[PDB]
Enzyme design. Structure first.
Site, mmCIF file in Angstrom:
data_model
loop_
_atom_site.group_PDB
_atom_site.id
_atom_site.type_symbol
_atom_site.label_atom_id
_atom_site.label_comp_id
_atom_site.label_asym_id
_atom_site.label_seq_id
_atom_site.Cartn_x
_atom_site.Cartn_y
_atom_site.Cartn_z
ATOM 1 N N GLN A 99 0.868 -1.175 0.000
ATOM 2 C CA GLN A 99 0.000 0.000 0.000
ATOM 3 C C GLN A 99 0.905 1.225 0.000
ATOM 4 O OE1 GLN A 99 -3.867 -0.604 0.444
ATOM 5 N NE2 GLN A 99 -2.814 -2.261 -0.649
ATOM 6 N N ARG A 111 -3.777 3.751 4.959
ATOM 7 C CA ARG A 111 -3.242 4.468 3.812
ATOM 8 C C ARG A 111 -3.793 3.872 2.518
ATOM 9 N NH1 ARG A 111 1.578 4.998 5.256
ATOM 10 N NH2 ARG A 111 2.438 5.851 3.309
ATOM 11 N N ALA A 136 -11.043 2.544 5.860
ATOM 12 C CA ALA A 136 -10.231 1.664 5.034
ATOM 13 C C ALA A 136 -9.459 2.458 3.986
ATOM 14 C CB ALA A 136 -11.105 0.608 4.358
ATOM 15 N N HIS A 137 -8.608 1.749 3.248
ATOM 16 C CA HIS A 137 -7.773 2.411 2.255
ATOM 17 C C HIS A 137 -8.631 3.082 1.189
ATOM 18 C CE1 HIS A 137 -7.528 -1.669 -0.150
ATOM 19 N NE2 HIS A 137 -8.737 -1.423 0.323
ATOM 20 N N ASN A 138 -8.183 4.258 0.747
ATOM 21 C CA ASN A 138 -8.792 5.017 -0.346
ATOM 22 C C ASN A 138 -10.212 5.478 -0.039
ATOM 23 O OD1 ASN A 138 -6.844 2.807 -1.789
ATOM 24 N ND2 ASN A 138 -6.689 4.845 -2.713
#
Ligand SMILES: CC1(C)CC(=O)c2c(nc3nn(-c4ccccc4)c(O)c3c2-c2cccs2)C1
Ligand SMILES: CC1(C)CC(=O)c2c(nc3nn(-c4ccccc4)c(O)c3c2-c2cccs2)C1
Ligand SMILES: O=C(Nc1cccc(NC(=O)c2ccco2)c1)c1ccc2c(c1)OCCO2
Ligand SMILES: [Mg+2]
Ligand SMILES: [Mg+2]
Lengths: 335, 337, 339
Positions: B196, B216, B237-239
């Site tokens: 990530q 991230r 969570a990511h994004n």
């Protein structure tokens, strides 16, 4: 930095373009610049590949005619993306060498090339294998063992008598080996049952941030090899998780649950204890798992979102469904 | 710090009715207030109760004034005035003062003016801490991360590498910003980690509760807008992208690549699906099961609430067998017609 | 640690049947027990299995005794005796011993006798630690907080300022006590932070799991009664009050200003809304969605359980359209009533 020809070789992909292109990193299709390699999975992006400014795009054969740049053709772009991201990974290490502010009991046993970050605390009897990395501020409790290649990010807590396999990765804030929720009752007063079991974590296990895995009461909590666990999960005492199972964020598991291999537990699910889920079971998000699952397949629960005005009526009718049922039975009897 | 009622009234833009020489030492609830305390009344039902309040002064509205039995500060909005005066008289200590000898700070870190770093905190290479930043004891701030001026981290906060945090933010203990997203590809049943390499961008004046995790991004970034407030034990969570001024209550779980608009309110313990969007001005009530995109503003809800266990047993069994109930209804409809 | 079987029987008030000179070194499960271990049997289905257990002694009832294939300790309550004997033979180490040179302790902190503070723990000004208190490694204890005698914090626990903890408590790692409540005012569309100047008051003999958060009150206090047990991943909001001896399982979320009575049992992953009261002796089963006050003792439940996805799809669709079903049933009733 790496040449596109070399990259295609390591990825076992077929090159269609200038193999002397230098690739410096991976990027998304919308963000890719010169020197970046990217990928596409959804065919909807085929048609604006002329707007992508990556130096190369990983794609399938059916995508090649739409290519507007050098291309690496493969069967599975997403898996190829995983592999090339590992080759081009920019993630730093939690620590390098042993920090002078680390507090390491003299009886700890350290392998070769062990790194320990600033202010980490290693208790007596701890065994760290070759190439293990302990992040800053971690705690590793008495007699715990961490296998070769495993890495803890900053501020991880490992309790005593814990076993972790090789090549594991634990993100910050996670606690492994806290007491299970075990208590006897003596006339309304809770009597603590000491939790003298352990946690056994296999190889290639990845655990997210602020996840808790309790130790067993007498025998052990067991995490199989290749398991991945997301953030904010609770794995209670004496849970057993089979190899290669995935557990998404915020899942709460009760004690003595057994989960088979190749399972997928959707985020925010709640799984009760003293029961078993068989191999190859998928539970979708927020699943309320009250009963054992004895057949593979996909399982789901929950009444999804509605506008509040609609929900008020839906919930009121559902709570009075017994009366609806009685009225239906009466109407059947009359007719 | 003690303050004169007349001076406190001026800073609050309130009308003073009573002795401006009164010395105010702190803020208290109406039931706990004692001499030297200032308190506030927002519920006019307590007008008859004011004689039982032992505070030296009470914030109230013009309509309340005839009922006062103490010095009174008249304002249009006593609740907001309470928030303001609580800030003026705040007793909360700072997470640290000065730079502790036990802190470990890389030589390449760039410290602004009046930065405080608590005992045993760890600051990696390339970190930039703006003016007046306070890092609590035991924190970790990863390589090349940047924390804007006036931002404060309480003890035992973990910031990973390449994180950007704005100005005047506040992060409570145990929170983790920038851990790896749950990104994996599947190869014949084996999980293959996707590094990530995105980041987290946190805006200005963001408040994050305790033991919250913000992952991230995989390639592009996880983004928290300006003025966002996030309670304890949330998972972002990511994004995920969260728009300015959105409020996220405790224990909310969000999946990856969710976009939440501006001015939203996500109730506690909600669960939000990924790879979709919630538009501006959406309120999801507590424990909401957000499975699909929300494309119109308004209030949304889910869940069948508590019943006596004996009753729930029938409710659950009947709902689970509702297809059969539906068939019986249609069958009876045909018979009657 | 090891104890003669006769002496263990005496301390457990158990009737010894067998060699009192047997040396017990620890506790183990029936399946794992070997020479030197004491185990217990609660399920009589294992009577036929006792020949396969290699424990040196087994705790059982009088009805089990004829089936024994080892020294036996006879009691009325094998499970409670197991808890007591597990405490006697506990192998759990202490979070710390002595005062670590790497701990940072403010000069104005006051320590009782036989206090242990772990490596790199941080103790703020005005803190008071009672006799026999143990602070694990990497902990933070904020200004003016008080921790009563015998209480123990595992590694990496965070205690904010002005917190009061009673005697013989136990807090697992990663837990945060006293963070700001989720309090904000609205100034023309801008959030304004409300300083949270209340506290957290934790009684005696309270046990708190890992990665649990307990926020401080806005003005008055968040209160945890005596003998309360709280599991991992729990969220206790500002100004929550929990009565004595209540148990809160893992992953429970409690909104602000909730009051829970005594002797309650809150099942895992439940969600309890705030500004309401739950009376004494209430059980909420797991994942319970509590939206209204509970005024009578008893057991309460919510939630629709799991189904195969294809079945769930139909169930969810029909439930979401239950208003139409209700209307059709009413219309059918009118027809059958000849109206
Ligand atoms: C930010 C604010 C000043 C106003 C606000 O909007 C809000 C606040 N505190 C909350 N706590 N919980 C909660 C927590 C745990 C369990 C169950 C519920 C909510 O749902 C909360 C909400 C919201 C209501 C609807 C959408 S957000 C304080
Ligand atoms: C405190 C005690 C000694 C006894 C007890 O009553 C109890 C215990 N452990 C639990 N784990 N979970 C759980 C955890 C995660 C997911 C789902 C469920 C419960 O719901 C638990 C309960 C309760 C049952 C009903 C109300 S509280 C151990
Ligand atoms: O369920 C995964 N995530 C996830 C996380 C957090 C919340 C949710 N919310 C829901 O589902 C949801 C909300 C409302 C209805 O449903 C999902 C999941 C599973 C397996 C995986 C995975 C992700 O990525 C790696 C591949 O294996
Ligand atoms: Mg140190
Ligand atoms: Mg939850």
């Amino acid at each position: 930095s790496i040449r596109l020809a070399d990259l295609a070789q390591q990825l076992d992909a077929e090159l269609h373009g200038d193999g002397d292109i230098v690739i410096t990193g991976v990027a998304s299709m919308q963000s890719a610049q010169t020197g970046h390699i990217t990928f596409m999975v959804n065919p909807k992006y085929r048609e604006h590949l002329g707007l992508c400014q990556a130096s190369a795009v990983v794609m399938t054969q059916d995508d090649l005619p739409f290519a507007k740049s050098a291309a690496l053709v493969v069967k599975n772009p997403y898996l190829t993306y995983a592999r090339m991201a590992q080759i081009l990974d920019t993630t730093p290490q939690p620590a390098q060498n042993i920090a002078p502010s680390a507090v390491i009991d003299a009886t700890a046993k350290l392998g070769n090339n062990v790194s320990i970050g600033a202010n980490a605390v290693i208790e007596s009897g701890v065994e760290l294998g070759d190439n293990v990395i302990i992040g800053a501020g971690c705690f590793v409790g008495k007699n715990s063992k961490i296998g070769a290649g495993s890495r803890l990010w900053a501020n991880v807590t490992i309790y005593h008598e814990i076993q972790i396999g090789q090549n594991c990765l634990i993100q910050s804030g996670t606690v492994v080996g806290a007491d299970g929720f075990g208590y006897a009752n003596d006339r309304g007063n809770w009597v603590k049952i000491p939790q003298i079991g352990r946690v056994i974590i296999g190889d290639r296990v990845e655990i997210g941030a602020c996840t808790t895995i309790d130790r067993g009461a007498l025998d052990d909590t067991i995490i199989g090899n290749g398991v991945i666990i997301d953030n904010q999960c609770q794995i209670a005492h004496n849970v057993v998780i089979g190899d290669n199972t995935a557990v998404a964020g915020g899942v709460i598991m009760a004690g003595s649950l057994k989960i088979g291999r190749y399972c997928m537990i959707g985020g925010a699910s709640v799984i009760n204890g003293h029961m078993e889920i068989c191999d190859k079971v998928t539970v979708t998000g927020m699943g309320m798992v009250m009963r054992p699952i004895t057949e593979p397949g996909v399982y789901s629960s929950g009444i999804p979102l509605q506008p509040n005005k609609v929900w008020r009526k839906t919930a009121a009718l559902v709570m009075n469904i017994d009366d609806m049922s009685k009225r239906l039975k009466s109407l059947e009897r009359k007719v």
